[PDB]
Design a protein around this nucleic acid. Sequence first.
DNA 1: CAGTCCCTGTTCGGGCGCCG
DNA 2: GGTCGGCGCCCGAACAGGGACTG
Lengths: 555, 411
Amino acid sequence: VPISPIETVPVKLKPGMDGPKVKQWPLTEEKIKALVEICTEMEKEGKISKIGPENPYNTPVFAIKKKDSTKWRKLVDFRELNKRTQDFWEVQLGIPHPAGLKKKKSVTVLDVGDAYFSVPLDEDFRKYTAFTIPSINNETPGIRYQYNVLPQGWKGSPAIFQSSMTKILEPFKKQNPDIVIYQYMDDLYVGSDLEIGQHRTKIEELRQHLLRWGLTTPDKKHQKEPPFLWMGYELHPDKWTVQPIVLPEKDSWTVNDICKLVGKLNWASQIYPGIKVRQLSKLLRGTKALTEVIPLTEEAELELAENREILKEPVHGVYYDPSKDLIAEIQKQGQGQWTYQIYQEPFKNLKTGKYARMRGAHTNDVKQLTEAVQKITTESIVIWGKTPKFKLPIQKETWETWWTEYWQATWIPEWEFVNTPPLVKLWYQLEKEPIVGAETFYVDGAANRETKLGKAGYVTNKGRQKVVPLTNTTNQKTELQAIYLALQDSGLEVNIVTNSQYALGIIQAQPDKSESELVNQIIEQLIKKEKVYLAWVPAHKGIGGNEQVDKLVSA
Amino acid sequence: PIETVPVKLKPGMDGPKVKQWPLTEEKIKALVEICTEMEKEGKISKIGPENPYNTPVFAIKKKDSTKWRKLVDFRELNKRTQDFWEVQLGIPHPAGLKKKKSVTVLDVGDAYFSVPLDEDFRKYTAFTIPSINNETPGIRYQYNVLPQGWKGSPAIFQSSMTKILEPFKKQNPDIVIYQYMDDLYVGSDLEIGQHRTKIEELRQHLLRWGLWMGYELHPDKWTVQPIVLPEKDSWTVNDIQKLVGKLNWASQIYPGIKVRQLSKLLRGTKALTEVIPLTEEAELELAENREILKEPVHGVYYDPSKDLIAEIQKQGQGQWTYQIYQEPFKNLKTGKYARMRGAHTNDVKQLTEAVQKITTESIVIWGKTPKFKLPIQKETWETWWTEYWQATWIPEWEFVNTPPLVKLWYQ
DNA sequence: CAGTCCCTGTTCGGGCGCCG
DNA sequence: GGTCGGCGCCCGAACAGGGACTG
């Protein structure tokens, strides 16, 4: 067996474990011919070699069809080998995005044919990649081979190829610094500001440089004229767009069909602005079977018809220009949904997106806006390496009031106010000092762990009083219930004294939405008020009427 | 031609496996030039995916510094090698460093590159440099010398460091020199003028052996933040309720606090704004409670075997309070920071500045870095904290969400 | 007193999308 | 088909840690 020009990667097994010893699956006669034809061809090219009875290892093997081709792909079920193979640190940190590309004069895209089969495997590791190929007869013992290159299906093949491919490209990038080479597996995006004359030469220099190491660049996969097909996009000299997305038109929707629908809508949201998957994702909650048929809700049918109409019109993204600033603008779409656009010139979007994660049981629009700003920031640093300037639908005084008074550290980068309704504001403000001439409500509430029964009420300074019995409640729900009573039975200005750290910790965060209906009713009451002052006192200390009302709501 | 000191991990623990976080353009360009230069000098060398270990890397700029500085987040590797730099090659902490009139910090991290690293331990110093828009895969390296920011580097270099400082310690026996991480703390009671002169002598004394910077401290002027009660002449129901709630929380620290007579003034269901005269038995309970807050807490002393824990509370208006403790309510030190960089505009910068100041004090006083309880959301901190870091060490931290109770540490 | 439970937040397991 | 790695989303179940009440 000849020596490959590429240096090999030393691979070990985990300490104290032996190679795989698994029996072959029964294969169809149409896949048997597809494997024997490929195995006898890879043996002639030095990619697999015969082995005798001295190799006590074996692993299953099969083959699947290639998309839009009569050729077959050989895959090995290395599930047992991957468990006992050493762990690898993947070098593929992410996925490149076309919005991060810069305008180049000449662009060329090429693909290396049979990428894994052109990189050698470690000499001492070839013994563990032993497999059997069944013949057309079950009584024939079959031919046993072992891999000399990177097999497809092994957990170390992609990590080894990406690092081996980078080492070959480094001397070319070191001699040609101005050439931009986007390396992703076998796909090579090569761009340059050189003239179209010298560009073809550098490409042929690269096709010969890669040829010296056993990497073939077939002219079939060679691309010289736009639009280029790269990473699932269509690269035009001035714009880009995703390859055509096809949504299923099922008359009866299953759970797996919704997952394919949500998955393509999330993929479409990167350039198609305004895609919403709120009511469609509500179909996946609390469901068990993937094949279970589920009818579309009225709010889900309306959301699907809107996403279908957005995909009718053509959209396109531009390329990144380092000479001009980066701008991101967010819009409050639905309840809990946010959309943003990143651009450098008006209406020329580099990319779009959406943020809709619900964090916590109680939240407001300012918190969700801050979470969206952070998602856009980290996403922008990945693609462009810088934080964009933000145009946020929140008044400058609204934000200044929020972060200065909040007890947690919060901050938003350099931003400016854009007047695009609906605006984000704080729906109520708790006073910092007690309100003079306002009725002071001493509220309290308790419950029994066994009977699930409790009381909730208040006592004021003007003699006002109320106690309400509650069924199937807890200590926390009663203390929230006592504050809700004081809000209902008071004027526009009211002081409220409670001994509940739980109820106080929720209201002070100024929420405008909650998963609890009792909290949403407290919020609606706080919005109707003009001045609300909450205060906390320790319980069981005989404080004010908080001891008199504790005794009334004890049972 | 230097022999390597063998280093092993703690028994039953694998190496670090921490992913690299996204880096900005100015940071990636600064790391490529530094690593290419370090690779040319043999300090580091490229590796491949057969190394399963990785440690995050970013770059900083110290206070009033133009030059970038490479920084590795060795917090995970330092945990998995804790028995080395404490049991075998520990460093004694001088208790007199905190009593000096002036203490200066020197970055001596460049000296660790002179000592080679054990071959069997190089596998754990792996780190990956990312690329913008994932243009190229990760460019992985590993260290061939003592890495900056590793707690095993000052331990191995300690024997070499003492022999370099022996001629200087002999001429100046009253100067205290402590070494923590890549920093050298030099403290003396000399006047500020001749103090900086003795530093330049030590800088040239270190340059002749193959090694700059300077950050001045004054531990004798470090003040504590006690719990103080208001000095009102006219008390309302709301003031007394806030006072009782504050004294109820303070009773967890000072067991002698009583609120019996003060709570008796809160018998009736009175309005919050109504003025209440203080009874004779309540005026004495308040004066006695003020005296207990002056006394030191009983049975509070630093335990070297216990970790330090620091809590920070955002007080608004550029004010930040903090407490350092090993056991709850046994605070070893309290304090308050005001008018830091980023005040009245950036909370994350003020918090990043506060953590660095608290950690520096924890090194001068006890020689350890505390674990912080940060009043910030995890996603908010992990997005911006690297933009404001100006120190060569990184403490450990967790995130808390404690709404304000009774504003105990600030009036 | 240590034991629960009421509440809330985080982490991970698993499905889909997309790329090679 | 039921191979591998990466990244993103959505969900629920399991984990986990603090506060108020009870033998």
